[PDB]
């Protein structure tokens, strides 16, 4: 598979990490 660059972090892969919730988005 050829992954794409999206310049954001999904909150689905973000658990126990607070910096995620500081900077996370979704579809």
């Amino acid at each position: 598979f050829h992954f794409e660059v999206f310049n954001f972090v999904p909150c689905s892969i973000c658990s126990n990490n607070p910096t995620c919730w500081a900077i996370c988005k979704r579809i």
Partner: antibody, heavy 121, light 107 residues
Framework: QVQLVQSGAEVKKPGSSVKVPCKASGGTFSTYPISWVRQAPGQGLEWMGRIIPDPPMANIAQKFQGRVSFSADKSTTIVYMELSSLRSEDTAVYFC??????????????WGQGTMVAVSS | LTQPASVSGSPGQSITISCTGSVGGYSHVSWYQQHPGKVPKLIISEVSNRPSGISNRFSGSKSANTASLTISGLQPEDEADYYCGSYASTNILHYVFGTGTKVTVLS
């Protein structure tokens, strides 16, 4: 358990492209993101970007953007990083490591062998 | 993250490496040791948490935006290139690594 396998050093011609591989021996490449760190022989570690298995999303730094492509063969779970439009500055050793973004580690614990990429000239 | 270029020490004493920041709760800073010709190894995590299998001579401290790695009982086997790394709370959550500190036991 989880150990990362990288290929041997590869000398490349200026302007070409190298696709350094990363294999998960004992790993599944389906939960924890796999970060790629670039290091010249004598350099400070420099994070290039990351690829995340749960969602097929790849994050790449702007400096490395435009040339780095995070491909991956789903079968046998082998991820490949291809640095396109090679130049003399690109000469460095490239490491793939398991980034523990989630979970307490909050660091890159398992590193790979490290494939040295040199632009011959 | 910026580190002292080199930190020299006599065998048995305790050296400290600073990691000054220009961010992830300022508790995500970790410490890495890279011996010449080998891959980097995680030595200290979560400011001071020590991964299993690491010697007790390594500790971690956090002041303001400066993280400190203190090696007690400095031995000639301890010397390596030490890097501190933490997330940068950016759009893609950059994991920023430190400049590097070459600890040297020399006396």
């Amino acid at each position: 358990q989880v150990q990362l396998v990288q290929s041997g050093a590869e000398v490349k011609k200026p302007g070409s492209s190298v696709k350094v591989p990363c294999k998960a021996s004992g790993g599944t490449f389906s939960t924890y993101p796999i970060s790629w760190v670039r290091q010249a022989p004598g350099q400070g570690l420099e994070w290039m970007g990351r690829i995340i298995p749960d969602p097929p999303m790849a994050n790449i730094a702007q400096k490395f953007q435009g040339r780095v492509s995070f491909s991956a063969d789903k079968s046998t779970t082998i991820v490949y990083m291809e640095l396109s439009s090679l130049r003399s500055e690109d000469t460095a050793v490239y490491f793939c490591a398991r980034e523990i973004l989630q979970s307490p580690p909050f660091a890159v614990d398992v590193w790979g062998q490290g494939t040295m990429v040199a632009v011959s000239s | 993250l910026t580190q002292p270029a080199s930190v020299s020490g006599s065998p048995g004493q305790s050296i400290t490496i600073s990691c000054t920041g220009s961010v992830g709760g300022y508790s995500h800073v970790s410490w890495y040791q890279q011996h010449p010709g080998k891959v980097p190894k995680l030595i200290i995590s979560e400011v001071s948490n020590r991964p299993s299998g690491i010697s007790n001579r390594f500790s971690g401290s956090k002041s303001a935006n400066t993280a400190s790695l203190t090696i007690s009982g400095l031995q000639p086997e301890d010397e390596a290139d030490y890097y501190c790394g933490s997330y940068a709370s950016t759009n893609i959550l950059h994991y920023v690594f430190g400049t590097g500190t070459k600890v040297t036991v020399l006396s």
